Amino acid sequence: VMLPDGTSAYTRDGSFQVDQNGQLVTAGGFQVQPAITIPANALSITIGRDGVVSVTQQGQAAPVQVGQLNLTTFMNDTGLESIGENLYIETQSSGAPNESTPGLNGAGLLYQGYVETSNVNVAEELVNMIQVQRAYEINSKAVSTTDQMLQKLTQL
Amino acid sequence: ISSLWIAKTGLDAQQTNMDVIANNLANVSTNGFKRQRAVFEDLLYQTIRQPPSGLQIGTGVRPVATERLHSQGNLSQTNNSKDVAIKGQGFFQVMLPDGTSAYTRDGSFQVDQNGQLVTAGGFQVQPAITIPANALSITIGRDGVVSVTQQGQAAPVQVGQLNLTTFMNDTGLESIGENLYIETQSSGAPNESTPGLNGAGLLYQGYVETSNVNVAEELVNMIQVQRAYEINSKAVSTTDQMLQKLTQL
Amino acid sequence: TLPSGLQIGTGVRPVATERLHSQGNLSQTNNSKDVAIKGQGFFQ
Amino acid sequence: MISSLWIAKTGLDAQQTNMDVIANNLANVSTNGFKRQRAVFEDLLYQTIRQP
Amino acid sequence: MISSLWIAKTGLDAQQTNMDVIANNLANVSTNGFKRQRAVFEDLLYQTIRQPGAQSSEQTTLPSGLQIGTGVRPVATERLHSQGNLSQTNNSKDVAIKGQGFFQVMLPDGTSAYTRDGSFQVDQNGQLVTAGGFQVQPAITIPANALSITIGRDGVVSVTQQGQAAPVQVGQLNLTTFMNDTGLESIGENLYIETQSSGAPNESTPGLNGAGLLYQGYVETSNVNVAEELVNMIQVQRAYEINSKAVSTTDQMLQKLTQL
Amino acid sequence: ISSLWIAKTGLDAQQTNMDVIANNLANVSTNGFKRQRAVFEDLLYQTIRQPPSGLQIGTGVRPVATERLHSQGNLSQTNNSKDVAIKGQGFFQVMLPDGTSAYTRDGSFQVDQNGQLVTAGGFQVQPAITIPANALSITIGRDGVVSVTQQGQAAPVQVGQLNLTTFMNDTGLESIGENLYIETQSSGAPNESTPGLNGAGLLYQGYVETSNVNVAEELVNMIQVQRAYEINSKAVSTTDQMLQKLTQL
Amino acid sequence: VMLPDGTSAYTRDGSFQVDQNGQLVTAGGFQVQPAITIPANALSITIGRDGV
Amino acid sequence: NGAGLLYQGYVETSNVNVAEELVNMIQVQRAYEINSKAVSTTDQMLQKLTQL
Amino acid sequence: NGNIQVGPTGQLTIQGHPVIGEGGPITVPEGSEITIAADGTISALNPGDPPNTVAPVGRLKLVKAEGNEVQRSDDGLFRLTAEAQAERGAVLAADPSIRIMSGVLEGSNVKPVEAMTDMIANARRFEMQMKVITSVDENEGRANQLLSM
Amino acid sequence: MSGVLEGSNVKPVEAMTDMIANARRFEMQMKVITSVDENEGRANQLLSM
C-alpha cells in the first residue's frame, strides 16, 4: 500500500473500496499497489484466486483483465512495525519485502467476497486478566510490606 | 490510566457496531435500502525504546467507516402501475426543495395533483414526467420509456422517459434519510444514462426492490456484539480493581 | 480521500399509506338498485 | 426479510394468477365464441455472486 | 471472537443459499423451459497447526497433523440441462425442443440471447416474437393473409394463403448449440447470454450436428422434480436447526466465560 | 498461578473440540466431505521426589491430532450425467493451476469451454478428458471409461479413462480447501490405479457422495463440549477466588 | 509402544493410525510393538477380540 | 492370562467423575480459606507482639 | 525459556544471544515454517513447496542438569557450578532422553503462597530487630550517667 | 423531520468510565494528603530544644 508520504506499508486487510477515480483503496484512501483502476461502467468485478482482477462490460462476453493484485511476503513476519490503521511497515528485523503473484513463491491465495477476522482467543485474554489482577495484588502487597518496614526503621 | 482508555474505546466500538446492526434490522421492509457494515481500524501504537528494536503497546479500536453494500435486492410484487424497481446499478434523480438533486434507489412513485411523478413525499423526480388527466393505464418499459393509454385512441402515446444515474463509487454517496442519497466529492460525477445502456440496469414495473438485509447475519452479529461488549466490560472492571488495590497503599 | 464516510443512521419512519386503486372483481348481487363501475371513477 | 420468502411469495402469486386464468377459462364454458387463455411465466432477476 | 461462531455463521449462510436455490426451483414449476439449479458447496481454509509431515522424532513421522478448518462457502450452482417433459398447448405457434439446442433471440440493445421456450406470437408486422416482443433470429415474417403456420421437424416454417394451395416456405428456424450449456449466464426473462465459459455458439439447422428437433404445438416444461425439492426442504430446515443449535452452544459458552 | 493455567489448557481443548464440531456440522451437505475428530493428549508430568519413589502433578490437555474418518458416505442422486461418485476407496486427481496435483473425493464435475473435464472451480481433472463438441449423452462406466454418443454413429465412441488414485495412508493428505487434498510426507506416494482394481473403488454415474457426518453424535458431543467448558470455567473461578483470598493476608 | 529413545512405554489408548509404511502408530507416530504392517491396498482392516 | 479383550471401532473414555471433582473443589476452597485464616491470626498475634 | 524466534536471516534466537544445538547456532532456511519434534529435531518446509519436502534441517540440543549442579550467572542464563566441572565436563552431552513438548510454553515457578509468608515473616523479624535496637540504645544512654560527676 | 423527537446525547459508557476514574483519582489525592500531613506532624518535632 502506498502511504501519502510516499513510503510503502503493508496490510492484511481486505475491506477495499474504489475512489471517485476508480483506484483500489483501503478504507482510508490508501492506494493499493500496483494501482488498479476500474473502468466507469463495470457490471461486476472479479478477483481470482491469484489476484487477477477483471471486470465485465455491457455487451462483451469476456471479462477484460483489468489488473493484477499481487502479494508481498516477508522473511520474518513477526518483526513488522505496526503503525496502526491496520498497516505494518517493514524494518530491519523483518528483512526486505519479496513481492510475488499470489500462490507463487510462498504467498497465499485470494478469496473474494470474504474478509479475515481477528484471531483473538478471548479465553486466553480472560484468564490472562485474572493472572494480571492477582499478580498486581501480590506486588502491591510487596510494596506495602516494604513501606511498613521502612516506617518502623524511621521511627528509631 | 491507559487500560481504562483502551477499554472505553473498545466499548464505544462495540456500541457503534450494535447501532449499525440495529439500524440494519429496523430498516427491513424499507424498499431499496442497502444494509451497512461498520469497518473498524486500530489506533497508533506507542513505541518503547529498548536500550527487534522496540515493543509496541497500542490502543483503541476506532471505527473508520460504515460501508453500504450496493448489491441487488430481491423484488416484491405490489401490482401497482406506478411502482418500479431496478435491475442492477442505477439511481433515480430527484429534485430536492433547495434546488440540488438527491438520488434514490427506490420505486414507490406516485402522481400529484398536477400529473408530475413524485416519490412518496412529493420530491419531484427528474426529468419531469407528467401523466395526462385521463390515462387509462400507465406503462413503464424496460428502457424507461413511460407511455399512457387514452380512451378511444388505439395506440399508447409516449409521454416521458425515465433516465437513471450511475456513480463511479456507489458507496461514497452520503445518505440524508428519506431513502435519499446525495452526490459528494467521493462518489464522482453523476452519469445520466438511459436504462439498459452504459452500465445502467433496467426497469421492472409493478415490482419494488426489497432491502438486502440478511437477518441471520445480524442475529449472529448481535450475539457477537453483546459478548464483546461484556468482555470489554470485564476489562474495565479489572482495571478498576487494580486501581483499588493501588490506592490502598 | 476517505472513499466512504461513516454514518450511524437512526431507525425508520412510516412515510405513507398508498391505496391501490385497481379494478376489483365483480359480484352478482341480483339486485336492481346496485351498480358497479368498470374502470376509473366515483359516485359523488 | 429472507431471500427465500420473497421468492416464495412470487411463486404463490404466480400460481394464484394461473388459477385465476384457469377459473375464467373454466367458468366460460357454454359461452359462445369464447377463446381459451393460457398464462406464460418468466423468471425474475438472477443476483450474480460469482460471474460465470 | 470465537473460532466456532464464524464457522457456524458460514454454515447458516450456506444453508440459506441452499434454501434460496430450492425456493427458486420450486416456484418455477409451470415455467416453460426452466432448468433446475443445484448448489455445489466447498469448504474453506484449514489452519495448519502441526504439519501432517514434520516428523515427531528422528525416525518417527507424526501422521495426520492437526488442522482445524472453517467455512462452507458455496462454490457453484450447476443448472441441469436435461430434457423436460412436453405439454400439449394446442397452439400452432408454440414449439418445443427435442434434445439439445437454444432458440436465438435479439435483445433490444442489439446483443443476442438464447431461450429454450416456445411461447411465440406475432406482432404488428408478422415477425415471430417471444412473450415480451424480443424478436427471434433469423427474422420470420408471416404474411398478412396467412391461415396456417406449420413448423416442420427440420425447422422449415411455411404458411398457407387463402386459395393458394401451395404452402410457401416463409422462413427457417435454426437452433444454437453450445459446447457447454451450463456455462450460460442467466439474465432472467427465460434468457441466457453468452459468456466465455459457455464458448462460441454453433448455429445450425435442427436435427443436424447434434441440434434437437422441433415439435410444433408443444411446450417444454420445467424439469423440476418436486419430490426431490420437498425432501431437500426437510433436509435444509434440519441442517439450519443444527447450525443454529451450534450457534446457541457457542453463545452460552461465551456467556459463562463472561460471568467469570 | 498453577491451576489457572491447567484450567486454561482445558478451556482451549474444549474450544478446539467445539471448533471441530462446528466445522463438521457446517459442512454437512458438502459432497465427499470426511468428518473430523480431534484426539487430545495430556501434557508433561512433573515428578515430586519422595525422600513408589515419587508422585506426579502434571498439567494440561494439549490437542495432538484431528484424524479424518475415511469411510464410505451415502450416495445422493443428482440426475446429472457428468457427476460421479466412488464405491470404496480412491481419489480423483486434479491439476492445480500452479502445476502440482491435488486429490478430491468429489464428483460434481462439468465441462468447460474447451470440453475439458473440470471440477466445479475449473481445475482440470487428470488425466485429461475431452468431451466432443456435440455429444448427445455422456456415460461413465463402473470402471471409469467415459464415452459419448454422436448423431449418425450407432456406437458410443470411447473418449477417456477416469483413473483413480490410492494412498497408503488415507488420513495423511492435508486439507487445503475446496474438498481438495494434497500429498504429504505421511500419506506416502500416490498410486494411479483403474477403478475396481488394486483395491481402488468403483464408479457410480449420476450420483454424488455425501458427507459422512452423524449429526446425532455431533449434537451429543456438543452437549459434552458445553458442559465441560462450564466445569473448567468453574475451576478457573475457584482458583481466582483462592488467589484473591490469599493476597489479602 | 516403542519410544523414540528405545525404551518401552505403555498406553491405554486406541487412537491408532497408519504411517506411510503401514506401521501402526499412536497419534504422534510412536510404533506399536510388535510392529503390525498393514498391506498397501487393503479393502478393510479387522482387529479381532484377541488382537488377530 | 488376565489380559482384557479388544473392542474394535470404540475408544475408552476418561473415567473422571465430574461431580466428585466439583465437590472436592468446594472442599479445597474452604480448607484453603481456613488455613489462610490460621496464617492471618498468627500474623496479627505477631504484630501485637512486636508492637511491644 | 522455549520462546524461540527466527530472524530475517534464519537465526534461531531464544531472546537474542541465539540458541545452540548440534554445532554452532542453529540456522534454518529463510522461509522457515519451522516445526520442532519431540526429541529436538527441527524440520523446515518452505511455504511454496510440496509438503513431502519437510526434511529435517537441524537438531535442538537439550541437557539434563538440576539444582545442586547448576547456578545462575548474573543473567537469566544458568551454568554449571564448577563443582560439577571435575565431573560431566565443561560442555555437556546432548542426553538423548530429554523430551520436548511442542506448542507449549512454561511459566515461572514463583510460588505466591511461600512468598506471602516470606514477606510476613520478614516484616515481623524486622520490627523485632527494631525493638532490640531501641532497648539497647536506651540502655546505653541511661547508662552514660555513671562516668559523670 | 416531523413526528419525531430527539433524546439526550449522554453516552453512558464514557460517563461510567469517567466516574470510575474520578473515584480512583480522589483516592490517590487522599493518600497524598495523608502522607503530607504525617510528614509535617513528624517534622514539627525538630524545633524542640
mmCIF file of C-alpha atoms in Angstrom, chain A residues 13 15-22 26-28 38-44 58 79-87 93 115 122 126 129-130 132-134 136-137 140-141 143-144, chain B residues 37 39-45 47 52-53 56 62 64-65 67 89 166-169 171 185-188 191 196-201 231 234-235 237-238 241-243 245-246 249:
data_model
loop_
_atom_site.group_PDB
_atom_site.id
_atom_site.type_symbol
_atom_site.label_atom_id
_atom_site.label_comp_id
_atom_site.label_asym_id
_atom_site.label_seq_id
_atom_site.Cartn_x
_atom_site.Cartn_y
_atom_site.Cartn_z
ATOM 1 C CA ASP A 13 -6.929 -6.245 5.462
ATOM 2 C CA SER A 15 -12.118 -4.196 3.029
ATOM 3 C CA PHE A 16 -11.334 -2.434 -0.232
ATOM 4 C CA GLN A 17 -13.286 0.289 -1.966
ATOM 5 C CA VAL A 18 -12.804 2.412 -5.079
ATOM 6 C CA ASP A 19 -12.187 6.137 -5.006
ATOM 7 C CA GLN A 20 -14.055 8.518 -7.285
ATOM 8 C CA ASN A 21 -11.359 7.895 -9.908
ATOM 9 C CA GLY A 22 -11.576 4.095 -9.880
ATOM 10 C CA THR A 26 -8.270 0.656 1.673
ATOM 11 C CA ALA A 27 -10.961 2.186 3.884
ATOM 12 C CA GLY A 28 -8.880 5.263 4.388
ATOM 13 C CA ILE A 38 -11.590 0.199 -12.672
ATOM 14 C CA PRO A 39 -13.497 1.474 -15.730
ATOM 15 C CA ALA A 40 -16.517 3.640 -15.077
ATOM 16 C CA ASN A 41 -19.306 1.242 -16.013
ATOM 17 C CA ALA A 42 -18.260 -2.212 -14.820
ATOM 18 C CA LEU A 43 -21.219 -4.520 -14.278
ATOM 19 C CA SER A 44 -19.174 -6.718 -11.947
ATOM 20 C CA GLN A 58 -22.187 -4.460 -21.024
ATOM 21 C CA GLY A 79 9.100 -8.348 13.060
ATOM 22 C CA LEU A 80 6.856 -5.876 11.261
ATOM 23 C CA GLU A 81 6.374 -2.419 12.759
ATOM 24 C CA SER A 82 2.649 -1.939 13.244
ATOM 25 C CA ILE A 83 1.941 1.743 12.674
ATOM 26 C CA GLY A 84 -1.774 1.430 13.360
ATOM 27 C CA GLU A 85 -4.641 1.779 10.906
ATOM 28 C CA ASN A 86 -4.203 -1.947 10.143
ATOM 29 C CA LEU A 87 -0.857 -1.219 8.428
ATOM 30 C CA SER A 93 14.054 -7.063 11.906
ATOM 31 C CA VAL A 115 -12.710 -10.911 4.916
ATOM 32 C CA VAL A 122 -10.934 -14.437 24.365
ATOM 33 C CA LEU A 126 -9.856 -13.572 30.291
ATOM 34 C CA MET A 129 -6.756 -10.790 33.018
ATOM 35 C CA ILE A 130 -7.240 -12.892 36.140
ATOM 36 C CA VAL A 132 -2.632 -9.913 35.804
ATOM 37 C CA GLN A 133 -5.043 -8.805 38.512
ATOM 38 C CA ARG A 134 -3.742 -11.269 41.082
ATOM 39 C CA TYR A 136 -0.764 -6.908 40.635
ATOM 40 C CA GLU A 137 -2.299 -7.513 44.049
ATOM 41 C CA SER A 140 1.090 -4.306 45.811
ATOM 42 C CA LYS A 141 1.408 -6.399 48.955
ATOM 43 C CA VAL A 143 5.275 -2.619 48.249
ATOM 44 C CA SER A 144 3.120 -2.327 51.358
ATOM 45 C CA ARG B 37 -21.357 -2.798 7.719
ATOM 46 C CA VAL B 39 -15.384 -1.397 9.334
ATOM 47 C CA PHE B 40 -13.012 -0.719 12.230
ATOM 48 C CA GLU B 41 -9.353 0.113 12.489
ATOM 49 C CA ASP B 42 -6.792 0.141 15.265
ATOM 50 C CA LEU B 43 -5.140 3.310 16.571
ATOM 51 C CA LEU B 44 -1.491 4.306 16.700
ATOM 52 C CA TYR B 45 0.941 2.173 18.664
ATOM 53 C CA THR B 47 6.808 2.549 20.918
ATOM 54 C CA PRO B 52 13.528 -6.202 17.473
ATOM 55 C CA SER B 53 14.296 -2.531 18.161
ATOM 56 C CA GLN B 56 4.562 -1.740 20.751
ATOM 57 C CA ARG B 62 -11.894 3.407 16.391
ATOM 58 C CA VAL B 64 -13.092 4.034 10.247
ATOM 59 C CA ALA B 65 -16.148 3.672 8.039
ATOM 60 C CA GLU B 67 -19.831 0.976 4.102
ATOM 61 C CA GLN B 89 -26.953 -0.459 -10.907
ATOM 62 C CA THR B 166 -24.748 5.923 -12.247
ATOM 63 C CA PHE B 167 -21.825 6.804 -9.997
ATOM 64 C CA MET B 168 -18.226 5.641 -10.088
ATOM 65 C CA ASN B 169 -18.227 4.800 -6.372
ATOM 66 C CA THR B 171 -20.616 3.614 -1.562
ATOM 67 C CA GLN B 185 -16.711 14.615 -3.647
ATOM 68 C CA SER B 186 -16.084 10.889 -3.197
ATOM 69 C CA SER B 187 -18.813 9.424 -5.424
ATOM 70 C CA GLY B 188 -17.758 11.271 -8.567
ATOM 71 C CA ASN B 191 -23.787 9.961 -15.131
ATOM 72 C CA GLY B 196 -30.073 -0.803 -20.120
ATOM 73 C CA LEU B 197 -27.136 1.114 -21.596
ATOM 74 C CA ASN B 198 -23.730 2.216 -20.336
ATOM 75 C CA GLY B 199 -23.661 0.131 -17.171
ATOM 76 C CA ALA B 200 -27.194 1.062 -16.104
ATOM 77 C CA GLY B 201 -29.673 -1.627 -15.177
ATOM 78 C CA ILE B 231 -15.711 -8.871 27.652
ATOM 79 C CA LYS B 234 -14.692 -7.229 32.250
ATOM 80 C CA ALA B 235 -11.528 -5.408 31.208
ATOM 81 C CA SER B 237 -13.697 -3.860 35.936
ATOM 82 C CA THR B 238 -10.267 -5.484 36.156
ATOM 83 C CA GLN B 241 -9.971 -3.261 40.889
ATOM 84 C CA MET B 242 -6.247 -2.945 40.264
ATOM 85 C CA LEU B 243 -6.615 0.779 40.935
ATOM 86 C CA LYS B 245 -5.510 -2.141 45.284
ATOM 87 C CA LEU B 246 -3.007 0.502 44.191
ATOM 88 C CA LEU B 249 -1.304 1.968 49.986
#
